[PDB]
Amino acid sequence: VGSLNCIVAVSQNMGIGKNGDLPWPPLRNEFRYFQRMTTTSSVEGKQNLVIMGKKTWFSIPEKNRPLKGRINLVLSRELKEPPQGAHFLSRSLDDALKLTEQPELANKVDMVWIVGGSSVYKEAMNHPGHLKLFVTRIMQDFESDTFFPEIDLEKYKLLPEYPGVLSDVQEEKGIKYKFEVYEKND
């Protein structure tokens, strides 16, 4: 299995959702970036895995679920099977990561990817090892009810650029944003 990653878009006030929707109006090219980064595999014969909590799964528009061309894994202790259209279910992030090494997945998975929600980001972000964060900074405040965990810059280094990530300021629908990549290894 390849690298472990989180990907998020976050407002200036650290918001990532409001009632299960994005705090901001749809940013079509930001979503394209999220689809491209998560899908683009780093090996032959494999797909990337996406790991998300249950609320994040059901926040994705049905037309958009599962995320195509990726293996979709949902985290829940309440669910007893994967939701309709999903591929795998685990009780917890540690369990999911253990699964990727079982014979059923070992072969199949390139990059791993954590796409939310807040508690899943927090546990990944505080677990030892090699982890990258792909963070889109939406450069405005937006009313939110779910937030990205604090990024400890003692351990997460902001990279000066990264292949496939634009370094400049972007703007859609009057909202400026920028892409960042952070990396820790502890």
Ligand SMILES: Nc1nc(N)c2cc(CNc3cc(Cl)ccc3Cl)cnc2n1
């Ligand atoms: N950078 C980044 N990182 C993530 N984890 C993202 C995840 C999503 C998934 N959420 C979502 C998707 C659609 Cl099209 C509409 C409604 C919602 Cl709530 C959307 N954009 C994301 N951007």
